[PDB]
């Protein structure tokens, strides 16, 4: 009867209006006679509005529709590691079935006020600019934002690749299992990304949740939440997860599609009234849990694509408001040869120094000051006006620090290698080097330290802290190399 | 003599700079008018779309 | 067969009532017999009370409420295979070259699912176009997806025709050209040029199939001709197992056409009036154009940019779908620097040191650094002029101006109206020339010598002429 | 029931009537109301019809009876319209009695496809030195005229219309070019004065005027270009050559925006509907040259666009630019310096190009486009000292620019354009005072017309300069400049 | 807070963050309910919702409810309807500025945009008012001269202008202060400066008694005593 | 105020401020679902302030010689006088006293910008 079944009244543009289904729960998963599934978003006095997870060609008026009782849930567990799955956890890599430790609903309430703990562990990205100036802590919600083709995905992918060092180790507390959510991307791009991950052997600890462009709007909508549920298994079982949403703008566009086709009242820029709710309930699921809760964590790296650098837009403003920090990428810096083109002025991390490797904190403390001064000094000097000698020296320092932060794609640096470079730059030892040669200096300097001073690198890594003796030895080595 | 020449040259250089600044002001005044009209139209379209449902 | 009656005719939208117990599935093709022949409607929605709403493939003028509609029982279907080569296909899949029927053994629906994730294949092979700016700063990928972005009057058609001339004549594999809301004049010009050059051969083997839904057509036809072009290219890809070229000028018209009907379909308008379904319509058309393990498809898509606004939803949505992009700009065109490609907004995933080589990557990166440095200074140069710059800035601006003019190139297809003979420049020659320019070897040459010359040898020769 | 061929008006407002009945009405069918005002059946719906009113809605009241015409909106066409001024629906408004019609043609028709067409290979000689030299227009071309208000757009179009006198008085239908001028949104007094201007120059006997003046209801302004194109298509389809000027398509776009918004269709960019592109394209695609199988007729279009603040990047301007085969950009910065017709030769382009140009002009006008662009380049930084080469460049540019100035309503034939451009390009003007260049032309042509009429006749008839004719023209130029 | 005020007679502090969230949630609920959106999408009832929230928070004759309200400013735009509506209800505004922060001058309050109802000579006394007014004049003159200094530097300015600009820079850096909470963002021990000492210090700096002190001695120090101590430490 | 005006007395009315009245009228109109306009204000918002302000008048001797002076206050966000309501009120009134924050910070208080401030009735009203 109509209690557990219904009749399709209308079909169009991926929406079905269904009569009956009296006992259906809001957002319950529904199955049409033709086999395609849908999700009952609208409950109304005489209708159910169901958004289809497939082609509406299959559904046609008069078709019988069946409840399921299941609100949308997805498989979770370590068996997904190395797999590529759709928004509902079905494998699409073409390998065998997926073993799962359990099933978890898509929307789940974020960890409350009580169980959390203050973020203190670092997410070592291996990018000099990020680790030095905008540190990312485990449990932090760090926004990556910028225009098209500026380097956002490159930054996230370098962060993912850098975790090889610890994912190979025995210490389960240092590991970081990665989930990459491709929303609206074309399938060939995800194929190239998995090719990159397997080429660098980073796939054995990664998970890909793909809702590509051709996927019906509901799956592009629902992929971030199911990927969050997938990472929350690691979070809740005492393990550490990093989830990259690439990118939330296309999820917002998909929700605009759904809401407008359900004829819900639009908001600004025709987005639905509650996109902020959408992204806030997604991002608040990242947390660092207390010792009672097994000390697990989930770290989020949302990606946002601005149009013409306009952050005042609705969705960019919302996500900037939600997240704990921003890594602004800018095309003008990209074409000046700065790579990964991070705008170190606009970029901020609110956890900041509380979640930074202590040695890199010790050496990097002054870096922000020099760069902040350099920006204004360069703005003045670009006009060609006469210059004071000390101001000229601030130009000398700032240009070389800017050159020092350049970094080739897919080449992350261990902090044992980041510390000497930032030390040399900050303490002025680079002022005598030709600006063109800084990229050579780095490449040679590390090769020197790994040969003549390997003990320094070993101590910097294992201790994580520069004692006075280690700092003096680093000074000695830096001056020794600069002499030669 | 060099001082007199330099003062006259700086006078003429600032005259040229003022001409160029005026031309840029005209260009960006036109651009400002265009952006003003576009902003008004787009926000009004958003309001109308919100009203017409 | 299932039959019904027209009940509402609005613009390109026709509502049909099927009092029979069964209704046609969505995307089905329906036929109305008319004095001109037949009018094909495509089912877009089911409205209830046994009514469906459909998009007309031709003018609805002359329709009367009550006209009998017959269901064809399947989607719009078009001829496929080699019998389509050397011919012009209408949107609904009919010959309009007046050379009689198309005798293909098969006809396939224009709507099909995109290839799965497991079917994707990833090439990393450079396609040499012979164009300095493209070959240097944004190399094209063989088997990849290529896009031209540009407003009106910047010359997208000339660029597309130069690409066809340079590539399609030597690709070996079959080609398909889809006109989606472009000029009928230029489709005629393409057809004539292909006949004269033997790419189309009425007496024998032909290697290009033409599909045209040009801009005179109703929105219903423009919204679907791209899928016919695809459906032919997909048959060449998957069934004939060939490599394929797939040109689409102008794919933006596919999106725009949908908007034209969206308000009539009853949807709530999206931003700036676009249809809510923009992203998913784009996805369903677009990542169906892809290389797969069965065959290789190189696709070149011209994307119009309304009011030169690259932030418009359609170009912005299209940017994500492409491997290589070249962005023609009016600001460059006004300088007379044709092909007007913006060297700091053209982008390509193949400009990678592992793909182009370290030398080419270094040359391209330094060229872009010089151009960006020059662009940053244009406020000071505009107000204060060159004199107040530092000597290093003056040298960099000189090299930037010379590089700007050196990136210009005369295409053969433009010779009709430019009067300048066409030049083709090899990839190695382009890299060597720009490497020489950045090394300052030609700092003495006046910048005028670099304008509209195919390579550094022609720069030297033109400098000699300017000296006499 | 009588509701089959008639209907009862349900409602009236915003220029739209809702009618009950008219069961057998065709979409876009023309209907007649009780008061005699006419409308077009835009929307057919279950139980009602939407009628767009080609007139003031005061003329229609609820409860009136409406009658089918049985005909899609159509206008009379034929040679009898020559010399007539007609409204958007082909009714005579000059007051000279009924129109004589060879037939009737629908306002909306699909432009001829790819196969029927031919490449443009014949010139539309405008009689303007700058246009005929630097941005030639061919028969079957669709060339945009674009620029600010009062920059001379209508002057260019009307000079092109007037120049056709010398051939329309001839015997060969292959040379005659019949001109349709479309006034959309223009002041009625302006159209009346334009008609008088044509009749003064005797250009009316081969021209047709279609007018939808500013006060006329928006649907008429929207419709007028389509019916004028239908009128020109008769000449096109009967092997005769026609020229149609749309002045302006921007005001047609404004009228279509009015209709769209009063129908409450969603506003798009700049509040225009998304359909506006399809408004112009299906119009401007009707300008074509047909193949020999089709009788080789052609219809040439010169759309006129008014750009606020000089924006060629605006929505409607870019739409039309993306539809036409070229543009003639008229620049205020030049017009108010007295540089008239004020062609911006840098942004003006004809992408049919040399195929349309007369070979004699293509010979003498060699690289003049490039030289004038070069002059606009070198002259920019001239105000670091001028090298003698830049001084020569500035002399050439100054003097060629002074030579390209032209008085309104003074078309100048190819046999008269060729000697002047020859003298300018080959440098014989370098030594002549530029303030006297306006004198130079008047004298030089006169000299040629008295001493060298044979050379002008040969330039006319051959359409080419042989080395003998080239050398004779050179000798005459040197003889005059020495004189 | 109201129960503590009206039924216990207490003086109450009502800390609120974030008021922008109240406005934004009102906008979301309004949009969901189908009300026609107002400018930039805010709800029609924005002003009256804010009034109903705010002017319940007031000092009745039973007790006083002090409130500190953190207001997020989207896109740093103080003209956005939410901050613009909030401003009208406040007695003292402490406008944090990104520009001041990028100079490194924390806590990065904008010395000019921040305003108080109580900065009146009848409330704080004429000496405090005079010092505050002179500080505002000095900082505003320095801001006005920056537009020229960005082109011609300080060399072209008159000696009076040079002196006032230098004192303005010293004052601008002297407004910085090390908070205790900031000891994770800084190693500097936090300090708390009395109002009387603040007035005395800024009067001393305005009068030029410390013209001989380098600018950096004023950065992130406490009272003027810390200025002297740090100046000696640098020397 | 019109009671004083009509009975031959002189009155002064200060509206503090009309921007918030316009906001309240926008609230009423939008919640009544009357057609919006620019900045979502109702179409006839000009007719609000013109209806309100034109009641300020100086009456002739026959009509009682009374008067009603009006000092409407207007708040400009970021100093933008091009906004809809500032434009309407500037159009309706006889002049403006323009206060600028830049002058207020400099210590020029009551911070009247003399260049922008104009009284079009002007000198006729001034004390000789
Ligand atoms: N550090 C780097 N050094 C050199 N090239 C880089 C670097 N980071 C990114 N790139 C290049 O910049 C281009 C853009 O990179 P990427 O794909 O990560 O950008 P994105 O912002 O994610 O782009 P989109 O919006 O297209 O998804 C690619 O060519 C990438 O190779
Ligand atoms: N070749 C010319 N020589 C001299 N004056 C000219 C010339 N062409 C145009 N003018 C002047 O320009 C005035 C306006 O010309 P015209 O009517 O062609 O301009 P328009 O761009 O069509 O204007 P509108 O926008 O008002 O319709 C003419 O009255 C005449 O004064
Ligand atoms: Mg990316
Ligand atoms: Mg005109």
Author numbering:
A (entry chain C): 26 to 509
B (entry chain G): 224 to 276
C (entry chain F): 8 to 475
D (entry chain B): 25 to 407, 410 to 509
E (entry chain D): 240 to 474
F (entry chain A): 256 to 383
Quote the study on this structure.
ATP synthases use a transmembrane electrochemical proton motive force (pmf) to generate adenosine triphosphate (ATP) from adenosine diphosphate (ADP) and inorganic phosphate (Pi). ATP synthases are macromolecular machines consisting of an ATP-hydrolysis-driven F1 motor and a proton-translocation-driven FO motor. The F1 and FO motors oppose each other’s action on a shared rotor subcomplex and are held stationary relative to each other by a peripheral stalk. In Saccharomyces cerevisiae, the FO region contains subunits a, e, f, g, i/j, k, 8, part of subunit b, and the c10-ring of the rotor, while the F1 region includes a trimer of catalytic subunit αβ pairs and subunits γ, δ, and ε from the rotor.
We purified S. cerevisiae ATP synthase with the detergent n-Dodecyl-β-D-Maltopyranoside (DDM), which results in a monomeric preparation of the enzyme, and determined its structure by cryoEM. Three-dimensional (3D) classification allowed particle images to be separated into six rotor positions, corresponding to the catalytic and binding dwells for each of the three main rotational states. These conformations resemble recent catalytic and binding dwell structures for an isolated bacterial F1 subcomplex imaged during ATP hydrolysis, where the absence of the peripheral stalk resulted in all catalytic dwell structures being identical and all binding dwell structures being identical. For yeast ATP synthase imaged without ATP, the catalytic dwell structures show αβtight either in the open conformation lacking nucleotide or in a closed conformation with weak nucleotide density, and the binding dwell structures show αβtight only in an open conformation without nucleotide.
